[PDB]
Amino acid sequence: WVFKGLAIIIAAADATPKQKFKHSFTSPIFISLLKGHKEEVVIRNVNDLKIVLQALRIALDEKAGNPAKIKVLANALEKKLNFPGTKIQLKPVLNKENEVEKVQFILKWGGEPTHSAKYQATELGEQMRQDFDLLNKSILQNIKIFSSSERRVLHTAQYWTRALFGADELGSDEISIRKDLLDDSNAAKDLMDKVKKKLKPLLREGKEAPPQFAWPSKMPEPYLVIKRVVELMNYHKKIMDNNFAKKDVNSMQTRWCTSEDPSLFKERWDKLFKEFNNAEKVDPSKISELYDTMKYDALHNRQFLENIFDPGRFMQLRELYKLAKVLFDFICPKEYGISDAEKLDIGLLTSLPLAKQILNDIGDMKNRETPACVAYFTKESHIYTLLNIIYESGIPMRIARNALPELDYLSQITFELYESTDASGQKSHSIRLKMSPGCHTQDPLDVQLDDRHYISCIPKISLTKHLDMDYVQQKLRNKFTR
Ligand SMILES: O=P(O)(O)O[C@@H]1[C@@H](OP(=O)(O)O)[C@H](OP(=O)(O)OP(=O)(O)O)[C@@H](OP(=O)(O)O)[C@H](OP(=O)(O)OP(=O)(O)O)[C@@H]1OP(=O)(O)O
Ligand SMILES: NCCC[C@H](N)C(=O)O
Ligand SMILES: [Zn+2]
């Protein structure tokens, strides 16, 4: 076998925690924000956000909704609309006459690439440049690059491209944005809500029997884990307030940087403490937010994390990190489906266009005369969903899904093509699928980092051996029907 092509899907590099407030309103002033649209509307322009802020202040005075919940939205928008990455999503709910009866107001902020992202992307670009210059130098001449429109994703694509070609500047003709392929799609959101509601009793209610729900034996039931996290969160809230109120906070870390100062720290945790103070109220969506900030602070605000939660790897803190990782490893992946059928549909509804694109590119690479590579830089969601398509296709795998490592920043899915032009002109092809969990550490509270705050990438692990190409395409294309 000899290498012919590579189709590699790459997730975004290190980024700031993603946070969101979501509330639904039916009052006309909130419906008018859609401006007649009956599909999801995204607002990013800062001036449009200032207009919405004014609308929220009107809504508050008019009591066009829960005033307390409108206040938090308005105050959060006012503070964050001047920060890159802040956007508003308006999801209309249509009645039986295709009339908007309700709109979901989602305020999102964060998710920006950190200063560390460039190291992870550059590391990957240099390693792959090395790899290609040892397999076939001609591969560098046939690179095709796609990217999501999300800022953290394109940031990753740009530094990877610079490292791969060894270049400073870069033209817009080299990276092609494909929103249809690599951005999130609300196509599966109708079915992901069915899943989200099925998870709430598991985490809140004292006893709810799950069918086909992976969970480690050494851990108690999920609702107990939630109750202990709430206890740990309420515990750390009191420590943090006591330390802010009493001690000099500006001396709890010898060096502060952009996005790494105690005021932003308190803002993030104040939100999470509010959302993790009642086990019977915990939203499964907020487990990922809790774990994302915990990764961020242990990675970018390590010293302050120690000192502001010091009562006087702290044991109550290590316990909190360990329990949060369990919830993120066995609850968050199942927002993309609990049962195999759910993981399959949701996986298809989300990433079918990308999946077809990969197979077609793989199909083209067989027929080429020159070796090539196609890199897809994608939002986090497509990696989860695409792996589910791989397993639920019936393709023989080398490792089971439950055994797969936790997906982290810059995790990759790889489709390696090898051609068999031997046996006369008869040309056969084998495809081997590999993945990497990205830049991950299993001991975030114990690793010692320098000013780069940079986690190295984990080498790839093989999901399959060399499989007949025509076989691997049929098993995938058989599931595209439903
Ligand atoms: O208006 P919505 O229906 O679009 O959104 C509501 C819905 O959220 P979700 O569907 O998961 O997105 C409720 O979930 P759910 O399980 O009851 O599902 P259903 O209500 O049957 O649809 C949720 O109640 P819970 O999960 O805590 O029990 C409620 O939270 P909270 O603020 O405490 O308000 P109240 O519960 O005190 O009224 C939400 O109100 P918003 O603030 O407007 O978002
Ligand atoms: N129509 C459902 C898929 C469309 C996708 N949410 C998009 O706007 O790209
Ligand atoms: Zn940092």
Author numbering: 537 to 848, 924 to 1093
Q: Any passages from the paper?
A:
Next, we replaced the catalytic loop residues Arg547, His548 and Arg551 in ScVip1PD Δ848-918 with alanine and obtained crystals in complex with the substrate 1,5-InsP8 diffracting at ~2.4 Å resolution (ScVip1PD Δ848-918 RHR-AAA). Notably, the GAF domain adopts a “closed” conformation in the substrate-bound structure. In our ScVip1PD Δ848-918 RHR-AAA—1,5-InsP8 complex structure, we located a crystallographic dimer stabilized by an intermolecular disulfide bridge involving a cysteine (Cys793) that, in apo structures, is part of the zinc-binding site. One molecule of 1,5-InsP8 is bound to each monomer, either on the surface of the enzyme involving the GAF domain or near the catalytic center. The GAF domain adopts a closed conformation in both monomers. In both binding sites, all phosphate groups of 1,5-InsP8 are well defined by electron density, with the 1-β-phosphate facing away from the active site. Conserved basic residues from the GAF domain and the α-insertion domain contribute to the formation of the outer substrate binding surface. A large network of lysine residues from the GAF domain and from the base of the α-insertion domain forms the second substrate binding surface, which is located in close proximity to the RHxxR catalytic loop. Most of the basic residues contributing to the outer and the inner 1,5-InsP8 binding surfaces map to the central β-sheet of the GAF domain. Comparison of the outer and inner substrate binding sites in ScVip1PD suggests that the 1,5-InsP8 substrate may undergo a ~90° rotation upon entering the active site.
